[PDB]
Scaffold this active site. Structure first.
Site, mmCIF file in Angstrom:
data_model
loop_
_atom_site.group_PDB
_atom_site.id
_atom_site.type_symbol
_atom_site.label_atom_id
_atom_site.label_comp_id
_atom_site.label_asym_id
_atom_site.label_seq_id
_atom_site.Cartn_x
_atom_site.Cartn_y
_atom_site.Cartn_z
ATOM 1 N N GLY A 1 -20.854 -54.553 6.670
ATOM 2 C CA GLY A 1 -20.817 -54.700 5.385
ATOM 3 C C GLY A 1 -20.512 -53.427 4.375
ATOM 4 O O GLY A 1 -19.988 -52.426 4.731
ATOM 5 N N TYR B 1 -23.026 -49.618 9.235
ATOM 6 C CA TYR B 1 -21.486 -50.277 8.980
ATOM 7 C C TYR B 1 -20.998 -51.317 8.696
ATOM 8 O O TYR B 1 -20.292 -51.433 7.711
ATOM 9 C CB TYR B 1 -21.166 -48.995 9.024
ATOM 10 N N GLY C 1 -20.021 -50.423 2.147
ATOM 11 C CA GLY C 1 -21.240 -49.562 1.976
ATOM 12 C C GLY C 1 -21.493 -48.553 3.629
ATOM 13 O O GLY C 1 -21.356 -49.705 4.793
ATOM 14 N N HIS D 1 -13.121 -48.314 9.081
ATOM 15 C CA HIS D 1 -12.299 -49.266 8.511
ATOM 16 C C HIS D 1 -13.112 -48.922 6.419
ATOM 17 O O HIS D 1 -12.507 -48.861 5.652
ATOM 18 C CB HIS D 1 -13.141 -50.423 8.399
ATOM 19 N N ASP D 2 -13.744 -48.163 6.707
ATOM 20 C CA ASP D 2 -15.399 -47.988 5.582
ATOM 21 C C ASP D 2 -14.136 -46.272 5.244
ATOM 22 O O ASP D 2 -13.357 -45.870 4.308
ATOM 23 C CB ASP D 2 -15.823 -47.794 5.869
ATOM 24 N N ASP E 1 -6.757 -53.552 6.926
ATOM 25 C CA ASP E 1 -7.622 -55.137 7.629
ATOM 26 C C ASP E 1 -6.950 -55.226 8.762
ATOM 27 O O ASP E 1 -8.356 -55.532 10.057
ATOM 28 C CB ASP E 1 -6.870 -55.708 6.433
HETATM 29 CA CA LIG Z 1 -19.613 -50.934 5.305
#
Ligand SMILES: [Ca+2]
Length: 124
Positions: free
Chosen positions: A29, A27, A31, A47-48, A89
């Site tokens: 990066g 995860y 997607g 965070h995604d 963030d």
């Molecule tokens: Ca990700």
């Protein structure tokens, strides 16, 4: 926006996000699929999920406001949707900092998609 997230990772974790967190585990990066592999990868998965739940504004391009005081990053401004991007963030930069004990680039950089099977994808 993403440039401010890079900035918060640099301020809080004292590391470049683009260098150490842009292709780590399943995860960290853009997607992701499969299981979070370790604690840093679970910080990326959360965070995604956090960006996925912001409605009303855009986490990639909107600019939020923050100040540093009482030893913390303090998200501000008069817009609650931009404050929630800031909170996503901030939480991730602190999670990265707190999990540096376990960070393992040798094992998780460029992990590769068969190691991240779409049928093991944890839902937010
Ligand atoms: Ca990700």
């Amino acid at each position: 926006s993403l440039i401010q997230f890079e900035t918060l990772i640099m301020k809080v974790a004292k590391k470049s996000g683009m260098f150490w967190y842009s292709n780590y585990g399943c995860y960290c990066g853009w997607g992701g699929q499969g299981r979070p592999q370790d604690a840093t990868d679970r910080c990326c998965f959360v965070h995604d999920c956090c960006y996925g739940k912001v409605t009303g504004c855009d986490p990639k391009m909107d600019v939020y406001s923050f100040s540093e005081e009482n030893g913390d990053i303090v998200c501000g401004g008069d817009d609650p949707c931009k404050k929630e991007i800031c909170e996503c963030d901030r939480a991730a930069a602190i999670c990265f900092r707190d999990n540096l004990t376990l960070y393992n680039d040798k094992k998780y950089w460029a992990f590769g998609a068969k190691n991240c099977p779409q049928e093991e994808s944890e839902p937010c």
